[PDB]
């Protein structure tokens, strides 16, 4: 519980309904319940999990940045700090929830390179979101946990996936942003985004029209970042 009494198939069906209704907190709760059933998530189901929590934490992160900026300008009593801390704590709780699903037991049960890479990329992302708000005796350990998860995902993806695979591309995109704005390694960020882009372009000739659209969509995002950074 609270989703333990609902059939796995019903949870997946409701997650898809919640997405259509733009009810992403509901969507995430249904996907948490589906994960906790203990069976594989398909490609489609992994996408549902990722999209649900992306939207939940995305709203929290946007709110945190607004409040953090107001707080910085104020430095009115304790209210701005208090409310920023409230949002921050709720954000950290969502990150901890996702990382707990990954560690218990999505990753160890991922018997595919493509499933394992998907989950390790998520682990990197949610440690990175923790790093965005960290300012404590563990910001350094959080940053190292993100890098480690991303690096392992990169190692597997380069061995087992073509350079145009959209999960591989989205992983490199996010690891590059990690380097630029979390790790203070803008040269690493630029190197990764550039090699990833070029190696995808060189592989496009192997793809169908549909796969080509998939890959070029993420290539556009790599290009946008390089255009910002160089």
């Amino acid at each position: 519980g609270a989703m333990g009494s609902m059939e796995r198939a019903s949870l997946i069906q409701k997650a898809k309904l919640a997405e259509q209704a733009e009810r992403y907190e509901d969507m995430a709760a249904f996907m948490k319940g589906a994960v906790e059933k203990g069976e594989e998530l398909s490609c489609e189901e992994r996408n549902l999990l990722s999209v649900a929590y992306k939207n939940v934490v995305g709203g929290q992160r946007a709110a945190w940045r607004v409040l953090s900026s107001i707080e910085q300008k104020s430095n009115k009593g304790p209210e701005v700090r208090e409310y920023r801390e409230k949002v921050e704590t709720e954000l950290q709780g969502v990150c901890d929830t996702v990382l707990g699903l990954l560690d218990s037991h999505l990753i160890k049960e991922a018997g595919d390179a493509e499933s394992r890479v998907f989950y390790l990329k998520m682990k990197g992302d949610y440690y990175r979101y923790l790093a965005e708000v960290a300012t404590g005796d563990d910001k350094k350990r959080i940053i190292d946990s993100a890098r480690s998860a991303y690096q392992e995902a990169m190692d597997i993806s380069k061995k087992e996936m073509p350079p145009t695979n959209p999960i591989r591309l989205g992983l490199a995109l996010n690891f590059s942003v990690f380097h630029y704005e979390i790790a203070n390694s803008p040269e690493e960020a630029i190197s990764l985004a550039k090699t990833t882009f070029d190696e995808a372009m060189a592989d496009l000739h192997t793809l169908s029209e549909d796969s080509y659209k998939d890959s070029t969509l993420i290539m556009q995002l790599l290009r946008d970042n390089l255009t910002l950074w160089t």
Binding site: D125, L173, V177, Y180, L221, D224, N225, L228, W229
Partner: peptide
């Protein structure tokens, strides 16, 4: 513009 992820 904000970087993309």
């Amino acid at each position: 513009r904000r970087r993309q992820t």
